[PDB]
Design a protein around this ligand. Sequence first.
Ligand SMILES: Cc1cc2nc3c(=O)[nH]c(=O)nc-3n(C[C@H](O)[C@H](O)[C@H](O)COP(=O)(O)OP(=O)(O)OC[C@H]3O[C@@H](n4cnc5c(N)ncnc54)[C@H](O)[C@@H]3O)c2cc1C
Ligand SMILES: Cc1cc2nc3c(=O)[nH]c(=O)nc-3n(C[C@H](O)[C@H](O)[C@H](O)COP(=O)(O)O)c2cc1C
Ligand SMILES: Cc1cc2nc3c(=O)[nH]c(=O)nc-3n(C[C@H](O)[C@H](O)[C@H](O)COP(=O)(O)O)c2cc1C
Ligand code: FES
Ligand code: FES
Ligand SMILES: [Ca+2]
Lengths: 408, 446, 198, 206, 251, 412
Amino acid sequence: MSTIIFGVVMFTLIILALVLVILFAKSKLVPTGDITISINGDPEKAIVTQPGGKLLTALAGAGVFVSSACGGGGSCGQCRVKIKSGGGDILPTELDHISKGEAREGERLACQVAVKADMDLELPEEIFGVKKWECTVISNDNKATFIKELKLAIPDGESVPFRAGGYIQIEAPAHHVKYADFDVPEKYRGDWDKFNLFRYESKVDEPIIRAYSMANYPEEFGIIMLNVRIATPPPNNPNVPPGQMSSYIWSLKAGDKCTISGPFGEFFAKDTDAEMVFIGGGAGMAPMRSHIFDQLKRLKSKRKMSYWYGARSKREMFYVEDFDGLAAENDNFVWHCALSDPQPEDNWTGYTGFIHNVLYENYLKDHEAPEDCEYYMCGPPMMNAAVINMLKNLGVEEENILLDDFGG
Amino acid sequence: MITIKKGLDLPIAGTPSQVISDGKAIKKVALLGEEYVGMRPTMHVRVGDEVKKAQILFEDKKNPGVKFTSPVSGKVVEINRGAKRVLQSVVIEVAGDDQVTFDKFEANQLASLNRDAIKTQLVESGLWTAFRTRPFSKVPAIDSTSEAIFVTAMDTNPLAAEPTVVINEQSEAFVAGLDVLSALTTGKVYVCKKGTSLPRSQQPNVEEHVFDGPHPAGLAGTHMHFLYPVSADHVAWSINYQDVIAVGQLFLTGELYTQRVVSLAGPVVNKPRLVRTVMGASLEQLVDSEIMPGEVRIISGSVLSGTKATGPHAYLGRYHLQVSVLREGRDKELFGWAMPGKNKFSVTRSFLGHLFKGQVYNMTTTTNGSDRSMVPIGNYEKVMPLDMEPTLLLRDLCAGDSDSAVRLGALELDEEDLALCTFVCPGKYEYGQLLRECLDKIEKEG
Amino acid sequence: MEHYISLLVKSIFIENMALSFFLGMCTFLAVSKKVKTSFGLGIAVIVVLTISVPVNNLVYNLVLKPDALVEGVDLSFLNFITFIGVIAALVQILEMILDRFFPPLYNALGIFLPLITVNCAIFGGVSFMVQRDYSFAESVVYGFGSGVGWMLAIVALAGIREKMKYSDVPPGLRGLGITFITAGLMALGFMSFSGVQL
Amino acid sequence: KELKKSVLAPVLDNNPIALQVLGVCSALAVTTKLETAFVMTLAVMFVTALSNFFVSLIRNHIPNSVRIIVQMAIIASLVIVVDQILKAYLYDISKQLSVFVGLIITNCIVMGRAEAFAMKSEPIPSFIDGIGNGLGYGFVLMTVGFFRELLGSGKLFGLEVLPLISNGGWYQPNGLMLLAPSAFFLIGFMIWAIRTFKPEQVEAKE
Amino acid sequence: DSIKKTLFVVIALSLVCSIIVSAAAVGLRDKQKENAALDKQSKILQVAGIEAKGSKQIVELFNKSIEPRLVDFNTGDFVEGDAANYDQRKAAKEASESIKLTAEQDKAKIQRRANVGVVYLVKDGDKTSKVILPVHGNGLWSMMYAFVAVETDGNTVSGLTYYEQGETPGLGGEVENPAWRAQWVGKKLFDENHKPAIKIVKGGAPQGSEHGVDGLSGATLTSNGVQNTFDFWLGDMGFGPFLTKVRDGGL
Amino acid sequence: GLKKFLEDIEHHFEPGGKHEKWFALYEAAATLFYTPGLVTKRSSHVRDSVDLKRIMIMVWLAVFPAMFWGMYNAGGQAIAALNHLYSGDQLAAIVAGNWHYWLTEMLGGTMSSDAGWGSKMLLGATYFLPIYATVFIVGAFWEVLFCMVRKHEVNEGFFVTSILFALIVPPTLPLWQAALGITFGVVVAKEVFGGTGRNFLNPALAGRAFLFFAYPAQISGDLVWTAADGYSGATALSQWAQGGAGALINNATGQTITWMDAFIGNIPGSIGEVSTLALMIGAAFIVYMGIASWRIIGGVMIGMILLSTLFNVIGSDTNAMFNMPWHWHLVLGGFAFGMFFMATDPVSASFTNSGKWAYGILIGVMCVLIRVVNPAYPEGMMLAILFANLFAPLFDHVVVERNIKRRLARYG
Ligand SMILES: Cc1cc2nc3c(=O)[nH]c(=O)nc-3n(C[C@H](O)[C@H](O)[C@H](O)COP(=O)(O)OP(=O)(O)OC[C@H]3O[C@@H](n4cnc5c(N)ncnc54)[C@H](O)[C@@H]3O)c2cc1C
Ligand SMILES: Cc1cc2nc3c(=O)[nH]c(=O)nc-3n(C[C@H](O)[C@H](O)[C@H](O)COP(=O)(O)O)c2cc1C
Ligand SMILES: Cc1cc2nc3c(=O)[nH]c(=O)nc-3n(C[C@H](O)[C@H](O)[C@H](O)COP(=O)(O)O)c2cc1C
Ligand code: FES
Ligand code: FES
Ligand SMILES: [Ca+2]
């Protein structure tokens, strides 16, 4: 019986002694003071926190997200920053997004770097102009069968500094919506009722955030507008609900309250004298219109330009009253469209099929030097792949091909 | 003096007689687009245009400011392109004698010219492309400099010409080019040569170094390894002796000097010898009525490293000073792999051939076996004289481990530095391709 | 001196903990990708084992073994808990020390540390020490030799796996299966010491 | 039925030994007899299930500084109880298992599941996860032991199947099946077969 | 968080775990010891020529048919002590309870011998029918232990079993073969002048002999160990002094 | 005409043909009979004449004297032992009950004590040839299976593996065990790694180790090294381990085994190992041709000599293996065969000149160590080579790291 008491006492004493030793070691070794991080060398805008964790936690408090688009996964790879001080090394998990030359330059992923010690940060191009806004929906109408044109107002007539082809951050609250409530008109309703898309619904129990592209150029003062496509589920597994944010945006109307922030972008046009070729399809109309308007109205350039658009049907296209007017007011622009689904009621006499084949067979096959042109791209991933292959076979290197892929 | 002991002097038949003679009439020349590493051209001419000597034909997108100019006055007749519209050659048909001219100086002023003026003259005349950079063997950027410029005044390639015979006719031009190089360099100029005498520059930063032994004793890569090791932060420039004569002529007369002296030799050449030609000359017209009947391969350069000169590529390369010709070995032999090969060359001693000292072979383009994996019987160590691990480096190249290859010393190498390793491989690997792929990855990753 | 040299040699070669007793296989198989990573891991294992075995020897001889505290009372059922507690506390303390005072030693060997508490080699070494009833000096030598042998084995496996960059392994064998086969082949060659009566 | 979905996933989809690398030492050691393989499988299953259950019960109160100490205290207590029971009721099998009864504490599966799942889940789910991982471990142990015992002694669970020449039969046992390299090779070929029939588990080329 | 909470949690958990562990460990000691003892008793009954099925029958037969005893090797006389709980294996390691053998005497390579050894007397009513001698020696891979049953004339073997060895199953493990063990019955340990005479014969023993047994085929390095075991344990340093007393009718 | 026939039947094995799945075998036969007839695509427009075919055929020819002497010696040993044991009607009955014997007598040979070299060689052939045929066929099956499944081309190297495996086994080995051994060696050690040039272990010794540890009773002991029914006799290394140089006696004839006997090859053992002279003659040719590494051979010799002399100086009272000199180590067992033909496998050895010396030294040291201080095994060459295969890449690593240091110092 005594052995039981001895065992209990010795077990407890041994465990307690080990715990106390480890606690004393921790108290003596690990530091407990606060640490500081600096930005661009300024004595202002510094951040002081307790050591440990990722740098994203510290930067989120001040609102400097640097376009961080996710808390995990990291498929985008947008979360890179140049760290100036001799901090921790670049971990093996960052080389997929950061090249060796960039690592030699000090580029690091904010989501992985540990901030247990003081460090110095530099942010390119002085992005400190990023701000959040309270906005009012001006109009949220539809121009086609599956896309909607969102317009936003900036109070007091102010104008957000940006460059053509950029995107913005957009947030939504918890909500539930059903597709039967949308304002699809009769001409577009003919396709919705075929699949009975009104049957679908979606919800989320917490607020969400996403990034979307803008559809106006700098001298379109005072407003921000976007083009959004519906996100219906695939037909093979229709039990799943549609997309959340697109459905949310499709619900609002004139005068509704909304909030945006974070104007970012890397799809900016280059400043050379070479020809510009714009190839687009479907929902990508926004940045294409932005660039086309910018180069022709604000900069008033004399560079050769052309826009090739891939549609579905004669009722799927929009902004022709703008593109035809541009083609007439400026002789340096030309517009062409091809569609894959010409119904008998269209009696279409123009180009048909996928836009890449039309472009190759009508313009590029006889082009004097296609490698000298600059190609700006946006559209469905598979059509992007087709276009990129066609351009590869023409000897166009990557430096002259630019793309801003929706959804990565 | 440095003496190389590991190497191989290939005993191929058809050795040229080191006497210069007039060459055939040339009516076409061309610039080969694929022989410049990392070049993406922007064309400044189109078919039917008339051009002057030293007039620009195209620029480089990835190397701004570098101009590729015409070696003759004439008319552009062809702009050949291949898969993915890669430029193969730009062919000019000789006619007239128009030319673009530049500034000229006295011989005693050359050693003290301004570096910027020298670079401007070279770039504008298009002679700037005679230089190449180790690592990566690319044309130097016009805004950069180097501490070491290596002049190659020796040639150990099989069937190669004798640099002494050529230089002794152009002593003043050679010395003037050396003076210009001395002014151009930020460190030293290394004149690499054999044990015999050459014209000398009196500047103190121009130095002569003698190399002895078999091939590759005459390679700029070997010279760099022994006198100025190169890495990502130490870059050297290379240029051969005839280009030095061209530079001297340029700065002495204000005119681009496009004459060449090449070796025309091989087992199927009736009268192997040295012939006066022009840069980019048509090899089909050069070797006309010079060869024995039968199917043959014409090579621009050496059999160890050179370009198969067929179709749109049938023109003398920019960095090549010889033309080689030999038969096509398409024969099938009954148990040919098991014969006692008295007439078979090899660096091993598995054949009767090595017992006959001084024997020369009518070598062909046959591959003496099929492709196989690497079984390292130790042939590479016999032919590689540099301080590296040949088997490990070659296996890194085969596996595609660029990071390991760089550590083992890939940055110091050119395609011509692995020609002997390709030669003696029992598995029939071709290591120049693998090295170039590795270096392309290294440049891509930054 | 001959006694301890014999013990060290037996610990390293005749009774290699990696390729004769086959302990620590999870990390021995997973971390063998690079020679120097394996080298750092092996150094950490050496330190932890060579500090763990003697301390557990002292604790067992002073507390746990029969009639150590009182006569007629033994506490040898606490062996497992005491061993693992000592190992875990020691591993964490050394992990903290390396990160705090020697960042360059942390980068070398401390980074591997969280998992080496769960490593059958350490616990098996302590158990074998208890079974064989070593002295304190014998325990020190045995722990050091066992760590050295484990390091040697893992570094050899890493060298082989780096040599295998030129191999062409079937897709279904790439990684785990081929590494298992390689380890089996290594165990095949290590049996040269099997009959040695050292 | 989510329960049967969860228990059976670690058998072939997330096998602890074949996809994860955990619990390899005991697999190499105790697979020369099917009886010892079976007993070790049951012991590991029981210990993992109960450790997960308790760790998840107290997961919200574990002080972060000494969480390893707490977890190993629980696991070691369970393993000590198991050792006492085995020595009291299965003396011969406990003798055969030698030091590997103690090494259940450092069997990587137990700690891996305790840290990865139990600390973040509820008691019943954690118990089910432990049972499923034990089943996945037992699959490999039993299949390897079947071949090793059969081809090394002509027996299964000690019952004679292939008569031996020494006993007057016709079969000569393979002596290498009684040594670790045989287990290494068998596990390698098992992984080969599994990743042939489930190619989604093939590792990418470096 | 608070060190107070840390200490409270760890102390409570330790109390619960320790109570369970200590209770379990102390509650099963008797059964564990019974298992350990019965394992040995089964082997002794087996070599004694007695059939027993089950733990209950093993205990019943061992208690009434066997009488453990202690013997002093130097003088061959019985000794006082609790033979039923003696541990010769550990007693051979203690300095005061054993002797270090000499390189010439250590023919079996055991390196030590205990002062007193345990022997088991087999009963037939009140009469003693056999004596079982535990012997051991070095093989090629491990130390091999066996029981040999000897009649009351001190010369004739009734049976032999190796109950612990670690040789290769095919070559050296054949010491456990029943067919090879059967050869020992009826053999004489000593010649007519009372010198050890057991011989392990390579290639097979002569037919009808009473001193030789077949060696292990292809396993001479284990046959040598088996021979050395008896060379030592039938000599003056082993059971020779006791076996002379047994031969003189001292049972 | 074979040349016309081969290209006549080619269309059957081209894609879409009748026999498109046997293209590997077709091309193997075609390039065995004739040369590929290909030209150079790129890089060096001229190539060396050597190829894997010639490398392997030279290594294969190098072992012919050893193989022939091995057959002759096996036959002579067997006949001598048989006549030592049996005579008259008993010998006649023993002959009638063994096909190896009555086939020899049917083909015109004799099993009497006055048998000539022809009879001895024939009796040795009836043991060697079945083993070699079984090994070759069984291994070729696996090679072809892997090539067809992975669409590779059958290469050379098994041509050497098979004969080397067949020459390192007792003359009495069972054929099913030979098949299992070659299966293990070819598949587990070479094929799963990608085939020739892509493994790290020695394929031939891997199978021998498999047999050694799986079926020790048939590849060890007194009953296997002489193919005489009912004969039991030890060999030199065992006899030395028992009783020193004085224990070397051939019980089949009563004579004393001398250094000249062991050097020439008049002793029992594995089929092809016995003749040090015959192995030396073959090894000289492939060393001269530059196919085998004299650095490896010298390292092996250095290690053996050093460790044997150290043991001789230390001495021992109870272990007779301590006093065997280096020149006796040279001629006993499989040391010479291993050193000349198995330690020189280019794929399994170190790839650096400095590493090869250490590789050979390790092999020799381990061989002598296992011979002397390991009582379980009388010989240790196979185990030593398999053990050094594991550490060759570490020597390469050390050497290349020193080279990298030199390079970073701007002197390389
Ligand atoms: C910088 C940027 C700018 C962009 N700009 C625009 C723009 O201007 N206009 C535009 O139209 N698009 C734009 N996009 C693309 C757009 O943001 C996305 O393509 C998508 O439309 C976002 O929709 P959501 O966030 O409302 O729905 P999400 O909730 O993000 O969509 C989730 C989808 O996944 C499905 N899903 C979820 N779980 C499963 C499962 N287990 N199995 C199968 N399916 C499942 C859902 O049913 C749904 O279809 C942009 C993207 C980026 C990165
Ligand atoms: C793997 C292996 C294990 C062996 N194990 C034993 C063994 O346990 N006992 C033994 O006596 N011989 C064993 N041998 C055989 C010995 O090495 C040796 O050949 C034998 O003792 C010679 O006996 P002989 O003199 O009667 O021929 C083994 C051999 C091998 C290859
Ligand atoms: C290449 C080669 C390697 C060998 N390796 C071993 C070995 O590792 N262990 C062994 O016991 N025998 C080995 N042998 C067999 C012995 O050399 C020898 O043939 C056999 O033991 C005969 O007995 P002996 O040693 O008394 O001559 C090998 C033989 C050859 C040809
Ligand atoms: S946004 Fe890509 S890792 Fe954070
Ligand atoms: S179970 Fe993982 S190291 Fe042993
Ligand atoms: Ca004892």
